[PDB]
Design a protein that fits this description.
The PDB classes it as viral protein. The structure is cut from a larger assembly and holds 2 copies of chain A (521 residues) and 5 copies of chain C. By secondary structure, chain A is mainly β. Chain A contains 1 helix and 38 strands. Chain A is 1% helix and 40% strand. In chain A, the strands form 12 sheets. Chain A has a 5-stranded antiparallel sheet, with no helix packed on it. The longest helix of chain C has 19 residues, at 29-47. The N and C termini of chain C lie far apart (33 Å). Chains F and G meet through helix 1 of F and helix 1 of G.
Chain lengths: 521, 521, 49, 50, 49, 49, 50
Amino acid sequence: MEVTHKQFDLSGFLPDQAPDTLKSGAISRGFNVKPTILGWEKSGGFRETNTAPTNEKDFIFFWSPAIGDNRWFSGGDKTVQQVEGNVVSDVSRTGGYTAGSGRRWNAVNFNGVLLMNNELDSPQYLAASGKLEDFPNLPSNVRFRTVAVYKNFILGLGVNFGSGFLDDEIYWSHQADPGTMPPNWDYANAASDSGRTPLPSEGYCVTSEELGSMNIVYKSDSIWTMQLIGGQWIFRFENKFPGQGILNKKSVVSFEGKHFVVTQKDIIVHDGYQVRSVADKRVRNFFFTDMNSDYFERVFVVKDPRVAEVYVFYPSKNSVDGLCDRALVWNWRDDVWSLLNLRPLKHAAYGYEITGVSITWDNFVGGWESTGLWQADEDVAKYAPVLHYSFRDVPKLLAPTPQALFIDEEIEAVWEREDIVIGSISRDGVPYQDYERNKSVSSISFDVDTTEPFDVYIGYKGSLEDSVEWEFAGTVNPMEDKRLFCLLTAGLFSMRIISKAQTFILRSYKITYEFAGEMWS
Amino acid sequence: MEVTHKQFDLSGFLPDQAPDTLKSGAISRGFNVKPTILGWEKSGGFRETNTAPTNEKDFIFFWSPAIGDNRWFSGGDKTVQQVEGNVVSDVSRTGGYTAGSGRRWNAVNFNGVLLMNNELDSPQYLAASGKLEDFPNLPSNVRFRTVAVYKNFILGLGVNFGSGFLDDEIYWSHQADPGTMPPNWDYANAASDSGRTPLPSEGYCVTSEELGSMNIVYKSDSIWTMQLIGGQWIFRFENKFPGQGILNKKSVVSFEGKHFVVTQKDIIVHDGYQVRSVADKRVRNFFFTDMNSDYFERVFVVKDPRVAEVYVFYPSKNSVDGLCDRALVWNWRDDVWSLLNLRPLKHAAYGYEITGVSITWDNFVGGWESTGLWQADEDVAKYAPVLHYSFRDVPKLLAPTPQALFIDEEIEAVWEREDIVIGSISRDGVPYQDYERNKSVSSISFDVDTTEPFDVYIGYKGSLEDSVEWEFAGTVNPMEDKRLFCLLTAGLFSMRIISKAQTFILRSYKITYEFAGEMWS
Amino acid sequence: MALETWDANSTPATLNTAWPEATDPLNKGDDHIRLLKTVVVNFWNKVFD
Amino acid sequence: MALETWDANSTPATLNTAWPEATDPLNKGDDHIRLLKTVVVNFWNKVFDG
Amino acid sequence: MALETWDANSTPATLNTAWPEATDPLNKGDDHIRLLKTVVVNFWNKVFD
Amino acid sequence: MALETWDANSTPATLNTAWPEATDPLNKGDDHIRLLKTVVVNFWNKVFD
Amino acid sequence: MALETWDANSTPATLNTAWPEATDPLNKGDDHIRLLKTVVVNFWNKVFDG
């Protein structure tokens, strides 16, 4: 008899459930593939942009007061540079920042001004002059672990007063007027309490950066809200959702009036009204079992502007330099999870890209074998930004491309499912697993859309307690044929597909099998 | 014919329903196993930490003003000590507290200050000096059974005025400024009524400690709310949910904007809007039938930070010293109940753990047979805290570990189901129990993920009125074989599995049987 | 995670790259080395003979 | 990451003989064992039956 | 000892399976790992370019 | 809870450890002792004969 | 808990002869009967058919 498992049911990467029972359209391992309504297709590659800071990088921010004013900031270690057009210029303080910065650079736009805090030196602002200068009317010693803004007040978290660090926050400023830095810090006179507040909890007040309209403050171990009420007490405080913290200062983002947060114990989306634990039976265990944790500060969260996706970059155990080698991609239009296995990466951000000189039949320098797309890339989507990636061993910043060639080199994809459902079929037409008889497999038939060839591996295990053992089934070239023949008997079966090609879309597949007795061990 | 009962349906420990009818994936007895989406797996063991107070313990609290300031408090009898790093220092009042304390120590953070009440001596606060000192501006004789905080007012419950105890509460304080102890108790002048309030009910106002935003006050036999309205009358009072009390001063905790409370008659979760009786047809009867009750004050409730669970430690009938020998674990991500059978325990709390010296190939002192995990434990989850447990006969505090070896010694697990469903099968494919015919059992086949061996016991009873009688079926080693053969005829059957191994995951099992006449007695 | 089920003639087929997991026990360390040794010897015997 | 820089598709050529030195931390030992597994499998599939 | 005598020119022939042993000291774990690395490299070199 | 169904040849198999429950009646006390006596005698007769 | 300290897996070695004294409270008698049951079963399974 035959069993037909069809993809495009939008189940996706489910590494937390038992492989034996995950539904067709679900896989247990693999990378560089993402689930769509078409099947299990392959993700694109990377091109290069003109931006190049030639410093240590480690952090990139975008500044653009108006259209065409494409200014790129690259905050490295001990040096902060500005990249505009084809020139790179220094914008750092006269006293270069202390060593170790670049692991801790944060930036924010305060009604048109840019502020950067390294936590290892005094907070800075970019002055009209064009050089980052230290803070205007605040005493020098005080330090904030992070710098945020709520309307007209610039907030600071984890404050050191010259005596030590208290893990509490200051409502710094006295209502700076738009376009101007704040008047003064004086928690005693004009703004009355312009700070000094406990926010008691077991945690340390990591990032209070995001605002839903009312700033939400995230402490490790708890969530709190903030509202502007004015008077003797400027702000109000409540404890909302105790027990849900935040992992890192870079693990928060907003979309469609909601927030995606990577808590130390979970990944959740919330709107102040309530919470929802996304990732609970899919990916929760895997993320915390494959993260190193020596580095937990190296994770960050980015939002793709062109397509609805959330990227969670994180280090793996296999990482030796502590950078980031993998990513968990979440699609919020339709809840699916993906995994990407990519080269070591420092940081990523999105911003507008300048155009390029028109390519003409006369000026092109390559044979038909050279890379490119008919549209010069900048022209594509001149309406929206494009992610830029700093890659450590690459001289220039990169951007995604539909073409899958990386710079020129090839990207491999792996598609693996463990313990496929082979057994009887319900009267409703759905198959279910049979754990009590051995099975014998004759052929595997593929329904794909790609034309280029791929490899197929077949795994077999005697029973649940055993481990999988792999056999090389062969190579499948869809245009010539779409079937593969192998004779095996075992308790359970698993299949792995490895491809290095520009296009690979998988729609479905079926297996022909027979029952072969009973299972013993 | 064959009947296949599959686990991982998330039913869990259901000791209140009739065993004959509880569904597959449900058990009636057993301990040290918890239900997951993978099956019925085995819980881990305990390691040791560096913290050791060497006093009577009986109470542990965590204090940490900033990151790295890991301060552990151990409030024993007649002596209160502070454990920091590798040193233990005394912080007690000049007059050591009276005997019997340690059964009644409560602590709370009031905008950055720590307050402890033993009820047997005057309330204390930890002074700037570093010694717990008695209360600052309150008359000496007055005593509160418990000490709580609501914003800027420190509340007291069950107040004695020098004449006797009234079981009523005082809005002590006159709005202490953050970081400062309260100005004065004067229910007559500046704060007007700074207390003296009846809260009439049949009960005694146990703990009003928790706040949902508006403090909730729990009296035995009733629930009441509190709100700050100001003016001549500082606070407002309403009776919400009469008839639902609280068992103990240590039986409340908050999570995700809700409260888990162990009432004297039920276990419930509430949000002020309404109530929900969790535990009603599962575990309600068992908890109150297996608690001793001579000791009802010895129970407490703890929340696990790493994973979503609520622990309800309580004494059993078999306890001879009155300590706590068992626990009811509740998972709120997916409603299941578990039971843990563990050594006598005094108290438990969670807090950050300091690091340790790096282990190197040169410095390690043991053979491959020694205990440990590849990651030194502190490094694991440096992002979150870890439960610490005081165990009475153990010199040092302990922490959970994935490894299952306790200190070195082994932990046993028992998996028991009574009156398995053996009978006809519905056209929908679900089995149902048959109470009118005898049955004959031939074999039992297991689907497990563990590789180590286990014991299996088979029980048989003639009919419902009889008791179970146990037979030793044999030992099952999954790698060699997964089947077991025994020939028995009886009215009803039950099975028990006992394992002492690091890993044990049970996915499903099936039974082969035949009908053997009719049931008589 | 603990170990690939294995015997004297296991070969490179029975190797799970991800198996020596981060939180996995030290006591299983000896076994992992030995699985690797057996695998290498058999592969050499197969293709150099 | 004081080990041979390694990646998912690396050949045994990448492996270095002396890097797991004695003073090295035990924690990165798993990284060395798994590095060894990945390389052996890759070499095998490429030449033996590939 | 339970550590094979080895030199930088060791072939896959040198290893004896069963050598990392349950009783063996952990201090020799790195050495055993390093032997495996020398053995593997030489064959990829002898048989492949 | 009251008592394991029992007779002269019950043996240690018919013992429910949890059966003498806390709120259970005193009048059932005599029976529980006797179940234990019968069980011990039969076990001794079985294994010392 | 003025009885032999006992636990779920204890052998009969643990039991003490004189502890249930006359002055002792009737309430802890159940604890003594159940202690006796647990021990007998354990000894039996360990040696008789174990």
